[PDB]
Amino acid sequence: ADQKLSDFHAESGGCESCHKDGTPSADGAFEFAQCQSCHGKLSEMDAVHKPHDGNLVCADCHAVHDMNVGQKPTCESCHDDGRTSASVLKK
């Protein structure tokens, strides 16, 4: 069955893996800290991730409830040059 990223994570730690008491915060800071607690920091990631260190939280790209496992974010919501992850990773 198609699984969202939120659901995939919840199978290995519950909704509380990312949300205090399984309940979302208003400003997403708690959740961003959880993402980084397992995955590390943007500055230690690849070329798509690094420039966003200090500017974005993970959820500004990864819409974990809306996106399938496997589905990755695109760039057009914030950049107007047609860039893709491919165009940046394999620059």
Which stretches of the chain bind ligand HEC, using CB under 6 A?
5-6, 9-10, 13, 15, 17-19, 22, 24-25, 28, 31, 34-39, 42, 46, 48-49, 51-52, 55-56, 58-62, 64-65, 72-75, 77-79, 83, 85, 88-89
In this structure, what token pair is assigned to residue 74?
A: 């695109």
Answer for the pair 49, 9: CB distance below 8 angstroms, yes or no: no
| DSSP assigned state of 4 | B
